[PDB]
Amino acid sequence: RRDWENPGVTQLNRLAAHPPFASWRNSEEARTDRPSQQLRSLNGEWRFAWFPAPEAVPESWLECDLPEADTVVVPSNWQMHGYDAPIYTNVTYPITVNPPFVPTENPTGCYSLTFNVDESWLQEGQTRIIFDGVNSAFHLWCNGRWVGYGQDSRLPSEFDLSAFLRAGENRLAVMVLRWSDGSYLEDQDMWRMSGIFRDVSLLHKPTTQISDFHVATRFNDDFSRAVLEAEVQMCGELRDYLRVTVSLWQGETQVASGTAPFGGEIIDERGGYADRVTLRLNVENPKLWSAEIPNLYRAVVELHTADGTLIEAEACDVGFREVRIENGLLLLNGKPLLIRGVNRHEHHPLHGQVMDEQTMVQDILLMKQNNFNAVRCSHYPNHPLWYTLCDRYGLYVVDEANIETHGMVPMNRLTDDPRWLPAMSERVTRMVQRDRNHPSVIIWSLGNESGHGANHDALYRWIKSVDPSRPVQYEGGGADTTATDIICPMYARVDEDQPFPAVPKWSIKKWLSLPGETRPLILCQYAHAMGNSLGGFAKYWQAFRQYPRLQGGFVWDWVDQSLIKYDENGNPWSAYGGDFGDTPNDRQFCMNGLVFADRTPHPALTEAKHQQQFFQFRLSGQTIEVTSEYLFRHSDNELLHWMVALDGKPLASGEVPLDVAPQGKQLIELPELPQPESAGQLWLTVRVVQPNATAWSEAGHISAWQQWRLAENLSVTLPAASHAIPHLTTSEMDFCIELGNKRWQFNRQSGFLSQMWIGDKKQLLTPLRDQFTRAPLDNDIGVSEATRIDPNAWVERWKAAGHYQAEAALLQCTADTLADAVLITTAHAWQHQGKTLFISRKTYRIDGSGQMAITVDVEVASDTPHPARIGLNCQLAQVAERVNWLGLGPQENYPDRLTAACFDRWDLPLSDMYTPYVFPSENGLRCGTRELNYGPHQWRGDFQFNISRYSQQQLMETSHRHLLHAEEGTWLNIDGFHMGIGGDDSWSPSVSAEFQLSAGRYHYQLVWCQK
Amino acid sequence: DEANIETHGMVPMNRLTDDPRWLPAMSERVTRMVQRDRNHPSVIIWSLGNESGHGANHDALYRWIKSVDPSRPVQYEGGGADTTATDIICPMYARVDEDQPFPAVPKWSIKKWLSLPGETRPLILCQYAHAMGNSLGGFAKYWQAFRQYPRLQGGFVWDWVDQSLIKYDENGNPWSAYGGDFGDTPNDRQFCMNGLVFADRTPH
Amino acid sequence: RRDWENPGVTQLNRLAAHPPFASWRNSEEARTDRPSQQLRSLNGEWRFAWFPAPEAVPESWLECDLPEADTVVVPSNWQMHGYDAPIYTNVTYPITVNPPFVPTENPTGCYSLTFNVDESWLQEGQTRIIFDGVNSAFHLWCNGRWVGYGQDSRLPSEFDLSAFLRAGENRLAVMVLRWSDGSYLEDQDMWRM
């Protein structure tokens, strides 16, 4: 039958979907969520053999172990065991588009397991097996006899094995197809893998059993009273002595309990459901659930007889909360949310798409620690434990059906086709049936990037009808279609419109007010964190705070999807698209996370944490006004620390307890501040510290900060007259200056400082020269490729203009002696194909103090693309252990991504000054720096800099960080000006005008002196 | 034009139509009908079937049609005649002045139904005046109400032709048969004959 | 596979639905709705045998006429030819309510037709068969080979026979089940045929 090439057959013999079950046979174990003896894990060592196609699988395999098989751990993706290569393609399908067929060469994973079954499970009741995740389709046999078939790689498939098992040893055989008609609905931008990659379990239920239960919580107008309603369905023979009790617990206190026999209310002319019952429990003053305070109760559903004998019990955590949209705003418990969200794929660099509790917990903690309160399940239902963790730690969740057909042309070709309505419907309905009792799920999503088709409208309405408690969203077809309750664009910019035909991406501020529009807008994906990115992130947050109906978004995305590979010596390195011989591929576009694959943060995470802070501040005189953006909790685990420093030197500090109600304000008067005895700028820094540990943070955690400049006292103090006058030595070839044991050499043909000595030690490996280019970031490159240039990308604009090929031509180089110093004057032009791109004019003034003051005045032709930077660079001869500067930090920061950095005196090891992006580029800059110290050198001015062992040339010629090698000495780039990095998206120019170097004439000045 | 979906015998009547596992089979009954008949001018309204309660599958399918063909209203009587799956209040056998307040699915007087709180839709009975045997008493009362009330826009009489079948006696002569006449059992006897005309088209 | 007891399989290999087509090769014929030589009727006399369950049908029937069959007119309802009784039930289903299963004694009508196809239809293009109404579900074979399956007794089921036919005589075999999971959706108050 080739069921895997027929969207009309998405399963055979599969049991109905339902919420998480454990069939406890003791109510207290169900209350406490303890492991149940009736739910067994079959995870562990299985037998596996790979075949190139299902036709190649031997019939002997059904009956007995293939000797060629290997023993492997399950769950797993077979690519992570090396059986075949994982493929990274973004939009283009990994197979020829010819639905519903798949390639004849279709990798097939034959897994099998010999295991025991106790006669107690077979003598009575039902034994089923549950495959939480099989990618992409599979046939199942038990003891050589065929059981069934399933599709949808992201929801559990369950089959009744009662009639197939025998007491003692049994053997399962599972044939997993990599490709199937289900693959047409699984074109998400991620690695394409396969296998039994989530848990496999055995569940025993009694013949008379709870087959489903739904929990709803409705409230009065001020949330001071609630009704918990639990609808329970059974399977088995109905008997008048059967009963259901539903009890609700708050910790160890029983809050409410109700019992009834089966028999629901009349529904229509034929009666009601004799096999169901609805229990209603009143709850006074319920503790409400939110991400701020995830209060939970426990609901235990017992199926029993009238005499009291328990048949079985099921249970769930319950969070009392209402989600609704009113008057254009998404409210939670009646208050408008501000979603500090992030999209998160299920990805591990070693295990592929298999998820474990430890990584999930790691992710949740880093998210909360970084001021995130929500997560979107991009783009499929997640492993079941994820929802339990979000319920208990507190994160709002968008649960999303596993439907993405991005690669079709047009994108809605299948979703507007009624023949694909059945397959799509199962991906939506079975997700709702599984997850509808989790309080953390607040919004349902119909999938991702599948255009807008009539099937979406049908499924939108199905959800609305079955579960009115949660809004439904969906971005395809323009982000504001009739299939979504929230305008939920991806990568729409704050102020700039992108009027694409048919599916324009308006500025978000404008979108809200289009004629007739009234819905809330929450971006389903925004600020693409690929490489050195997040430029402009603050612009989104300023808009979300100013516009009520802009209720936030989900950053794209949490974690880079890089995979580990090992080199010749066994050392690991991070790989991306194409690194497994996969082709076609989309190279580094699989790495868009705020964190690297191993969970180390990229510098962009701190920018997100700061802009997503829950306390806002204003200063007026001595007064700091703290405003709380919490909706529900008081600031009961926070104090404000303040510190005043003059140019990095601390002068005063204190701490004050914070007691701010949700949305309230607190005024804090700072004490009178003694005047500083010295020139310099006083800076005030405040930080919000949580003194006590929580379930998600350690004592001392810093959750918010802000700085302000206070008084400045400009220096008017005439230096101090020099003990000596430098000497100028002129030769045909050079101008040399000597002072004490120092010497500087200016080559007269190049017009640059080519060497500097301390004693007899040379300090430069390469001359000090202007630099107008950067090793291109992912955002500068976009989708441009050698094979297919995008002439609009910044890197191609700069290449084409000759920025990377231009050579300095000398126009002037003179030397003069002044009363106490020597002055070198130079002028250079940079040209390409006979056009002058840039003109740099400088003076170097070396005085009796040994300081060399450099003034730079640059002209940039108006018609050349605005340059990446305007600075100087050199390769220093020496290497030093530390870098110390007075400027913004401590982490990497760029003009359009420097809000989180603070002005202070920072000191880091040199390697911390390099950011190891997997695809190397310009990195490590720190802006707003007034003083930089390295070795015996010191540079003073108002500049941006980076310093590392890798030249820009090397960074730009190297595609993987593991292949970089430290060069001799230290490369120093010191910029008077540097372009923004952008990141609203990484496929079209996204640096805002205000961060482009378009002024035409630029001036900067620096002093280089010795320490 | 009405989809071939009727699950009247289920208990409750929407047991299958509220079950998502039956959504695919129901979907094809509706979508394949619209794909076949949507160019006929005579079809002015689509119906989702008959006597199958009101289930979420109906709401999904109602919306599908509204999306694919906005040119025609969609009606469906199941679940009370005025659910979210119908653009027209389309009761069967609701009386002119007399209410029949059955639980869950009352059959109001049609004049009263139009004005229930918040109601604004037109009302056209999907079935009214059951012409079984010597019947049609009270027909005029419907017509007087349809002409007086703008929003009472008529209805479809139940029904056109008796479903009697011909059998032959021992002498070979034909006779009209009804339920149970073929040994069929259980059967509902003469309830299959409700038409304004006899099976041979002779008028009653 | 017992496809007739699985609401997840309502068809196999069926073509998409669409409005009435006739494939005219003359535009003036299309303007006036004249008969089209490309749309042929297969109505008329066919071969038919009745069995009490699909399990009873002999395999020989797929490749050869059953001598015991009768010649009957199609379209027709087999109860009207006296092979079994029509049933008049209003609301109560005519079969036990146990979805999606149906009775094991499930009246099966085995229809077949030997018919000619001209080479011109097979040299180029697509030849499909269209069953406007088959109650309640059926499997179709052509020249002994299985083609597909369909449900919904009141809409046309169409199958591409291009790869199954040959010039000259061909034989269709259609196994029609009286009861199927589609019966659960066909409980109208009328005779059950």
Ligand SMILES: OC[C@H]1O[C@@H](OC[C@H]2O[C@@H](O)[C@@H](O)[C@@H](O)[C@@H]2O)[C@H](O)[C@@H](O)[C@H]1O
């Ligand atoms: O992380 C990659 C990112 O790709 C996104 O799609 C990018 C494409 O967008 C099209 O609309 C087109 O404008 C192209 O120029 C561009 O390559 C996708 O939208 C995101 O979901 C994400 O996969």
Ligand SMILES: OC[C@H]1O[C@@H](OC[C@H]2O[C@@H](O)[C@H](O)[C@@H](O)[C@@H]2O)[C@H](O)[C@@H](O)[C@H]1O
């Ligand atoms: O021509 C018969 C007529 O019956 C109608 O149903 C009659 C009555 O029968 C009971 O068995 C039902 O439970 C009850 O609700 C129903 O009203 C049916 O509505 C009509 O469509 C028609 O078949």
Ligand SMILES: [Mg+2]
């Ligand atoms: Mg399939």
Ligand SMILES: [Mg+2]
């Ligand atoms: Mg995509």
Ligand SMILES: [Mg+2]
């Ligand atoms: Mg490529």
Ligand SMILES: [Mg+2]
């Ligand atoms: Mg009777």
Ligand SMILES: [Mg+2]
């Ligand atoms: Mg079927």
Ligand SMILES: [Mg+2]
């Ligand atoms: Mg002709």
Ligand SMILES: [Mg+2]
């Ligand atoms: Mg021949």
Ligand SMILES: [Mg+2]
């Ligand atoms: Mg009926």
Ligand code: NA
């Ligand atoms: Na807002």
Ligand code: NA
């Ligand atoms: Na990506």
Ligand code: NA
């Ligand atoms: Na506090």
Ligand code: NA
């Ligand atoms: Na690079």
Ligand code: NA
């Ligand atoms: Na009227």
Ligand code: NA
């Ligand atoms: Na009747």
